[PDB]
Symmetry: C3
Subunit: 149 residues, 3 copies
């Protein structure tokens, strides 16, 4: 009977949706996602900023953005090496903004940074001791993505 | 036409279900699951026992339970820090039972434990060297869930 | 109704397929998959060659095979200990072949290897120098699976 088969199909699809959600929750938990907190993931690959943005966007995340000290430390831990943050002053020199919009608030700049060095630096990397340095968007640093809480 | 479309979609569905099962298999393997052994996993978050139970049930798992010295060792290495076990003596003082049911088979109490210290301690935690200490269920410890072999 | 519901379910199936693809991409990323590069994964379990092949087969992968020094180094780093490679001379003693078919191209044999020692050695393990040694297929070494670039 077509209708009974259609109803079973709806149930099969709803069951699959729920199982996929469960799979997504288990993976986030295994990646260290804390309850009600956003999480960070890296493949430890170094690449220019444009590639990190593309990669994270493709995974439905964004380049990691430290909004506070705890998150900064979490990102530093995940990365292990220098890594790009989702913060740049490409739109207007001197005004750092998050890739997702809004003016930069919390910061952890190394002493004497940002300094738009040489020909100019519009991207930001979390470096030694978790401090920040503005650097060329064309330089290759570790790709760290963040996913919603 | 319609009956054919429906049959073709039932086939796509079966294939998708098998593909998701694969994703689950590969994820567990990547997280260290050994052939024929229970899969133990943590996000390294410390919280009260009530929360651990809720979290593990939310992922369709259960709070980690060491049924023997080998599983106890496995849990010890996953947790790294003090972690709640799925065991309590909430029914009868001194009678430790698994949250999933039954009397405790294996145990690894630390010297002078269990002591039901102070106002009482009805939960259990695996601590240094993998030894056990009873503790208040309200205290916050690492959340470690288990999934079937 | 019938046809509308059937059309909706096709949309649901395609949406679910896209979501599962996303989940697989994100899991590959967390597993360390580098852009356009093949990747290796291990659960750190040690088992006989027969079991490694069966396990990787279940996961839709293959026993890790280094096609060059780069891949050889990657497998060495994932395994951490001796691990089996998808290379054997089981068919014809002395002529090592990939389990995936074809004659062994790249090789990194330790001096004096392969020597089919004692009772016989038909499988190959990448040792703690990246160098290779032929060994009994019955011996238990780390299972490292390889997935496509
Ligand atoms: Ca500029
Ligand atoms: Ca600038
Ligand atoms: Ca700078
Ligand atoms: Ca009590
Ligand atoms: Ca007690
Ligand atoms: Ca105690
Ligand atoms: Ca032989
Ligand atoms: Ca041989
Ligand atoms: Ca040998
Ligand atoms: Cl720049
Ligand atoms: Cl208690
Ligand atoms: Cl052999």
């Amino acid at each position: 009977a077509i209708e009974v088969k259609l109803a079973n199909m709806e149930a099969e699809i709803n069951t699959l949706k729920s199982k996929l959600e469960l799979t997504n929750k288990l993976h986030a938990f295994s990646m260290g996602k804390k309850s009600g907190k956003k999480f960070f993931v890296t493949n430890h690959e170094r690449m220019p900023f444009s590639k990190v943005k593309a990669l994270c966007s493709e995974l439905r995340g964004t380049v990691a953005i430290p909004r506070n000290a705890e998150e900064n430390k979490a990102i530093q831990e995940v990365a292990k090496t220098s890594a790009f943050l989702g913060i740049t002053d490409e739109v207007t020199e001197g005004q750092f903004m998050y890739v997702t919009g809004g003016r930069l608030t919390y910061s952890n700049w190394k002493k004497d940074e940002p300094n738009d060095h040489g020909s100019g630096e519009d991207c930001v990397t979390i470096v030694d001791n978790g401090l920040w340095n503005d650097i060329s968007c064309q330089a290759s640093h570790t790709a760290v993505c963040e996913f919603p809480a």
